[PDB]
Design a protein around this nucleic acid. Structure first.
Lengths: 138, 138
DNA sequence: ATTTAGTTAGATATCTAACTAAAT
DNA sequence: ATTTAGTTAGATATCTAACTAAAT
């Protein structure tokens, strides 16, 4: 019986935490895992950073910064697109695809373990309640 | 239909942002708000930094860092505990107490604005399930 | 012995304000 | 001659590694 500030704060932090530990063996952070994971799914769209910035609900610098790390790992690649020299377009590298195929399990577990804690009727109402709340902030 | 991670992750983040913007009034960050708020509530006990870490579920360095930020602002003061010289007792300065008394509405404002989004039973379920999901992540 | 309490410093994530590089 | 894409400055928060100092 606590504050929503407390609850959402704690839960979120412990997911970054639990997931940071499991992701250790791949030398990435959860944020990095998620971005990588995102790129696995939607790179078909000739992705550019703003697009990612938009998808991750994070700022332009924040994303610039994360991508830079990932490219230092050579986990991704930014060809400076042709129509614009400003635009860098983002995609995985085999090494990054290999990585994604390899850690994706971790994310899936936590989800399942979570959605194991409840029954289908709950998860839909619960997850559908969550969505509603997120919007109100956003 | 979103993965739980996305939801907690996004929700907690914007809460920080909404809270952070509103607090801009007071020259403090969302976390500083929460820490001072705790200090205001439990100050009498009286807390060591490690007490704060446990309550806030944070590592020792992280608390050490925030407290210093709060100390710089002159909103808390700390001194060495006389019996156990290891410890530093943390307390709110008079300035800090007033500051809390000022900003507390915001935290309440946001908690309500969330609560106002569901039925009393829907909220009852919500907060209840969340505790369990929190628990399940240790 | 070993556990506790706190600091410091290098990473990453994040931010806003402000930059440069370059397309309109 | 002007937005617009991406980066940098420097701030907070967070973690671990590494430390010191102290208690049990």
């Amino acid at each position: 019986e606590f504050t929503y500030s407390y609850l959402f704060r704690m839960i979120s932090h412990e997911m970054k935490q639990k997931a940071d530990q499991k992701l250790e063996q791949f030398d990435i952070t959860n944020e990095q895992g998620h971005t990588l994971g995102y790129l696995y799914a939607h790179q078909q769209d000739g992705l550019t950073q703003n697009d990612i910035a938009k998808a991750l609900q994070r700022t332009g610098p924040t994303v610039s910064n994360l991508l830079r790390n990932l490219e230092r790992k050579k986990l991704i690649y930014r060809y400076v697109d042709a129509q614009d020299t400003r635009r860098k377009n983002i995609g995985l590298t085999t090494s990054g695809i290999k990585l994604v195929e390899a850690f994706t399990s971790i994310f899936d577990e936590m989800e399942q373990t979570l959605v194991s804690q409840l029954s289908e009727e709950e998860n839909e109402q619960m997850k559908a309640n969550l969505t509603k709340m997120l919007s109100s902030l956003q």
